[PDB]
Amino acid sequence: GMELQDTIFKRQSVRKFKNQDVSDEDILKMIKAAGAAPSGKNIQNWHFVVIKRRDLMEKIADVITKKQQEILVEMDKVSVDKANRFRKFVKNFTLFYLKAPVLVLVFTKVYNPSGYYELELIDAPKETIDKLFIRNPGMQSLGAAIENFTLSAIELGYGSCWLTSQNYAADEIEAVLEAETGFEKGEYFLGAMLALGVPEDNLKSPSKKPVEEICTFIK
Amino acid sequence: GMELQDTIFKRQSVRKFKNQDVSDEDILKMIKAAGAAPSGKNIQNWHFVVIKRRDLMEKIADVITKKQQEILVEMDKVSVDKANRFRKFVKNFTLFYLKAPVLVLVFTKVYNPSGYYELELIDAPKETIDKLFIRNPGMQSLGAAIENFTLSAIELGYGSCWLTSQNYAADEIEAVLEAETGFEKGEYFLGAMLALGVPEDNLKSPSKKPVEEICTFIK
Numbered sequence: 505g506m507e508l509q510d511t512i513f514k515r516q517s518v519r520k521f522k523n524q525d526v527s528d529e530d531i532l533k534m535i536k537a538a539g540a541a542p543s544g545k546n547i548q549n550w551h552f553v554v555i556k557r558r559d560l561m562e563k564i565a566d567v568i569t570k571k572q573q574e575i576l577v578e579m580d581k582v583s584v585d586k587a588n589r590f591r592k593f594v595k596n597f598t599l600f601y602l603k604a605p606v607l608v609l610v611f612t613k614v615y616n617p618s619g620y621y622e623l624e625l626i627d628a629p630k631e632t633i634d635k636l637f638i639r640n641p642g643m644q645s646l647g648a649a650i651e652n653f654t655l656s657a658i659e660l661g662y663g664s665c666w667l668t669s670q671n672y673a674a675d676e677i678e679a680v681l682e683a684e685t686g687f688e689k690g691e692y693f694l695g696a697m698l699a700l701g702v703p704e705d706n707l708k709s710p711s712k713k714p715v716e717e718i719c720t721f722i723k
Numbered sequence: 724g725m726e727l728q729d730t731i732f733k734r735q736s737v738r739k740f741k742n743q744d745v746s747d748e749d750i751l752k753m754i755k756a757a758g759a760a761p762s763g764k765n766i767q768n769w770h771f772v773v774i775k776r777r778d779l780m781e782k783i784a785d786v787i788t789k790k791q792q793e794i795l796v797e798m799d800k801v802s803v804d805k806a807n808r809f810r811k812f813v814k815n816f817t818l819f820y821l822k823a824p825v826l827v828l829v830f831t832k833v834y835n836p837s838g839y840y841e842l843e844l845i846d847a848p849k850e851t852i853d854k855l856f857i858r859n860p861g862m863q864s865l866g867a868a869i870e871n872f873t874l875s876a877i878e879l880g881y882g883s884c885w886l887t888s889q890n891y892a893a894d895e896i897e898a899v900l901e902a903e904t905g906f907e908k909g910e911y912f913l914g915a916m917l918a919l920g921v922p923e924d925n926l927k928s929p930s931k932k933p934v935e936e937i938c939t940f941i942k
């Protein structure tokens with residue numbers, strides 16, 4: 505096993521991977537850890553789709569690219585500068601996931617949080633109800649589950665990168681998954697993906713805020 | 724220290740606390756761990772306000788109650804039973820934090836995710852851009868931080884409950900904090916609270932989904 509703080513401070517966004525496998529049994533451990541995460545009213549708004557199928561990983565890449573190109577055709581009319589930065593960004597911060605042996609699609613569902621049905625019952629303005637979602641407790645919950653998964657990967661000798669940069673193409677990703685596998689998402693939609701494998705060594709991360717910057721102790 | 728899985732499977736929502744203090748040094752270790760969480764584009768959209776001052780904790784409770792009562796007097800006109808369910812809910816799942824020695828207010832700020840500025844650039848429909856936020860990557864990031872805090876609390880001999888049920892009164896909570904401490908939130912807003920202490924014995928958690936239900940291995 506591995507001690508908690510060790511895993512926490514070891515954690516990086518892994519974007520380069522060794523040519524080694526990740527066992528289904530180890531992935532299942534990661535998922536059990538995710539499943540034990542806290543969630544708003546125990547909604548447990550998560551479902552992990554584990555993909556090792558190369559052609560499916562590549563088909564998902566292709567749909568991201570198709571959607572990205574549709575956006576780029578319009579961006580080029582406004583600012584080739586901005587369009588070109590987007591071209592580089594998707595390459596380096598989305599499609600790098602093909603470098604890993606495992607792609608995990610994390611599906612989720614909307615959690616209507618405390619206050620929502622109470623305010624709806626009394627015909628509160630939508631503007632008031634919307635304020636509950638600026639701090640989206642449903643996505644806090646998803647993040648707790650994905651962080652449990654992430655730390656457990658590290659304990660088991662692996663590492664990962666969390667991804668939401670694909671989500672302008674989420675509908676298209678869901679569609680190809682369904683065509684290729686018959687997976688039925690129901691009310692769920694894509695929340696995040698994880699690129700998962702054995703990390704290369706000597707990976708880099710940006711500096712973080714000093715702990716004293718991110719807190720205030722009231723005296 | 725404590726091994727990761729041991730911490731993950733020890734974690735419960737702690738709503739009853741022993742009469743014992745939490746050291747500032749230990750709380751700082753929790754926040755340092757929180758600050759190591761991944762976040763979209765390294766935004767680190769979190770600030771932890773640590774409160775031990777009893778009168779401020781009570782003042783926060785009173786604005787939660789006052790806001791609750793404004794909702795209740797309208798709910799009673801539609802459904803007294805539903806209003807009664809909300810009365811019980813707020814006692815059991817919100818105002819119990821007063822039972823702990825420490826209240827942490829977790830402030831956060833909006834993260835405009837990938838796709839946002841690109842779609843804005845090309846005057847994409849607001850309804851399209853809104854879809855990025857149904858999986859709010861900023862709040863996924865916040866959840867990752869608060870989970871790191873949560874697990875660290877357990878390793879150090881404490882426990883906590885995560886709260887978002889107060890957030891129909893978030894603005895009012897922020898106003899009390901500001902009025903009583905001088906804290907300047909700037910662009911940040913209340914995301915969650917944590918009730919933090921040495922946990923009571925015999926804590927109960929609800930039944931969870933079986934792991935087979937929360938994953939799919941594509942074959």
Ligand SMILES: Cc1cc2nc3c(=O)[nH]c(=O)nc-3n(C[C@H](O)[C@H](O)[C@H](O)COP(=O)(O)O)c2cc1C
Pocket residue numbers: 540541542543544545546641642644645648734735736737738815816817884885886887888889915927928929
């Ligand atoms: C973002 C989020 C918000 C939550 N808000 C509350 C809350 O306001 N009050 C409460 O009593 N529990 C709250 N919880 C705890 C959940 O009720 C709890 O995690 C769930 O019932 C599972 O129970 P367990 O944590 O003991 O395993 C919250 C959890 C999450 C992650």
Ligand SMILES: Cc1cc2nc3c(=O)[nH]c(=O)nc-3n(C[C@H](O)[C@H](O)[C@H](O)COP(=O)(O)O)c2cc1C
Pocket residue numbers: 515516517518596597598665666667668669670708709710760761762763764765860861863864867
């Ligand atoms: C919800 C969220 C979404 C993220 N999306 C992406 C992404 O699409 N592409 C990527 O390369 N990294 C992504 N990341 C990783 C962050 O860029 C990374 O956590 C941050 O830069 C800090 O680097 P570190 O994780 O190595 O410490 C995401 C992280 C979070 C938590």
Ligand SMILES: [Cl-]
Pocket residue numbers: 668669670763836837860
């Ligand atoms: Cl993003």
Ligand SMILES: [Cl-]
Pocket residue numbers: 544617618641887888889
């Ligand atoms: Cl809530």
